[PDB]
Every structure is written in structure tokens, then in C-alpha cells.
Copies of this chain bind each other. A is one copy, B any other.
Amino acid sequence: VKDAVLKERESYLQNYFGTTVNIKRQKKKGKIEIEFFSNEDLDRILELLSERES
């Protein structure tokens, strides 16, 4: 597995919420951190993570 595949997704995620996104590739034991500057973005970001549209 090459992180480039996930890192190109970082680019899309940043534009998606209009915010900063960082994936930590650490022996597969990492985390994706979606930053937010308001509690409004927070509620929205959690909404995508929930995918309630489905």
C-alpha cells in the first residue's frame, strides 16, 4: 500500500469541508484528523462521517 492513494484523498477532503486535513501514516496505526475553526464545521464534518444522507 502506498500513502499517495490516501494522500490524494487528503487533498479532496480539505476542499470538501473547506478545512485542513491530515492523515498520519504510522504502521497502519494512524488517524485522520479533520480540523475545524468553528463548531458549525464540526457539526457538518461529523455529519459526513455519519453519512446520514444514505
Contact = CB atoms under 8 A, between A and B. Distances in A.
Interface of A: 1, 5-6, 9, 12-13, 16, 23, 28-39, 42-43, 45-46, 48-51, 53-54
Given A36-B28, A43-B6, A13 B50 contact: yes
Given A34-B31, A37-B28, A23 B42 contact: yes
A45 to B, nearest CB: 6
Given A9-B50, A53-B53, 6 more contacts: A5-B43, A23-B42, A23-B46, A45-B49, A51-B51, A54-B54
A38 B35 CA distance: 22
A5 to B, nearest CB: 8
